[PDB]
Symmetry: C2
Subunit: 247 residues, 2 copies
């Protein structure tokens, strides 16, 4: 899909059970390039399983997911990423004791053109990602010396080395200090303006709604409501089930 064009992620009628125990009955949603979409709702009522079904870590019992008109419903996580659907798992045990430059370089060493990249083109790509994420100053830092903010910028660099159309952020706000909220908002804004669509699931409603273009409230394994934040907040059923009366 050309640099300025709108990729599409289309999710229809997701369904999942374990013991039945039907955790997701029917969830449909859409995400376009440059759009930030929130996947919210009561803890355990299906937003999380829905989210993981779209990452590809939870296999569908029914439904369909298509990325630019091609189905990916059955592809595992790593193959969806090759097609430009990237998951950010927050963790730095993957970084071990390698430097920031080393971690970004290592992901580019797996890319293909359609052959291997030269050591020179890997070097140039590395520099361009560091400078774009404003972490060039962190290039020689061990992964243990990095803040949560710095770590996330590095994972973004890693993800951008695959040229994704969509990035899935798993509870980025869980347990983080209010000073860190700014950092996250800026990273999301940055993805927006690079024409990458963002799907966020979180428990932190105020933080998530504040940066979303569209949100889906998942209750009782289904979509209770969907809309721009302002419409979501004024929805009577969302207020009765999830938000409460003065939010």
């Amino acid at each position: 899909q050309p640099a300025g064009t709108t990729s599409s992620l289309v999710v229809r009628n997701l369904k999942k059970r374990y013991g039945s125990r039907t955790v997701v009955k029917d969830v449909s949603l859409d995400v376009k390039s440059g759009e930030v979409v929130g996947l919210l709702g009561p803890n355990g009522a299906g937003k999380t399983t829905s989210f993981y079904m779209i990452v590809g870590l939870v296999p569908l019992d029914a439904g369909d997911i298509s990325l630019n008109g091609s189905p990916i419903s059955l592809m595992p996580i790593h193959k969806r990423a090759s097609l430009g659907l990237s998951y950010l798992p927050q963790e730095a045990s993957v970084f071990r004791k390698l430097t920031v430059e080393q971690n970004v370089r290592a992901v580019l060493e797996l890319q293909h053109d359609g052959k291997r990249l030269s050591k020179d083109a890997i070097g140039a790509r590395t520099e361009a990602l560091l400078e774009e994420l404003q972490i060039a100053h962190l290039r020689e830092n061990p992964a243990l010396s990095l803040s949560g903010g710095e770590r996330r910028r590095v994972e973004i660099a890693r993800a951008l080395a695959s040229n994704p159309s969509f990035i899935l952020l798993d509870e980025p706000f869980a347990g983080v200090d209010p000073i860190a909220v700014l950092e996250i908002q800026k990273i999301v804004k940055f993805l927006k303006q690079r024409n990458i669509g963002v799907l966020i699931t979180d428990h932190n409603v105020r933080e998530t709604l504040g940066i979303c273009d569209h949100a889906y409230i998942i209750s009782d394994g289904s979509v209770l409501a969907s809309g721009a934040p302002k419409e979501i907040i004024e929805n009577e059923s969302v207020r009765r089930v999830y938000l409460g009366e003065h939010f």
Copy 2:
């Protein structure tokens, strides 16, 4: 009259000092927040007070008497009750059975076990006080989050605690649930029970606190009523940032 007094808590694991020096006070009827950056000492401080983590240095005293070296169960008999999130009720027993089981450990003032009649009366009074009398025969597994919390409270109140330690009550709960929790805390305040809350959710916690301690770099960075905490320039630089609003 009741006081919880914590002086100069310290905890090191090898080359890491996770807590250098943390002191705080809680009085009956007061709600106290233990906040600060993730990993920077509030959590270990909290668990040192609960008794899940032994002190390396410092002292904790409850109504005059030291408890630093007492295990969790003995701190509770002296009126210091720990409420973790979703982990305190007997899963399989009914609501009435859960409340009854904690009253079966109590004594009268003479140090004698309670009669079947005093347990009966106390049970009914707690059920009606927490508005869960209608749930009395429900298994604890069949209860919603709201109902489950009220039952944990009943279980805690059946100890006659002077202090309740609430571990991360707001973690992952939806805004409907936040209001319920604030009301339960208000209700403990009014029963002249002191509450020490540690949480990551600053707006929710500060909104119900009489006093808060911000823990950074293993120490107390600042302490005060909420209004003074949020205007404190070090708290703003380190933890809250520029845009944080209450």
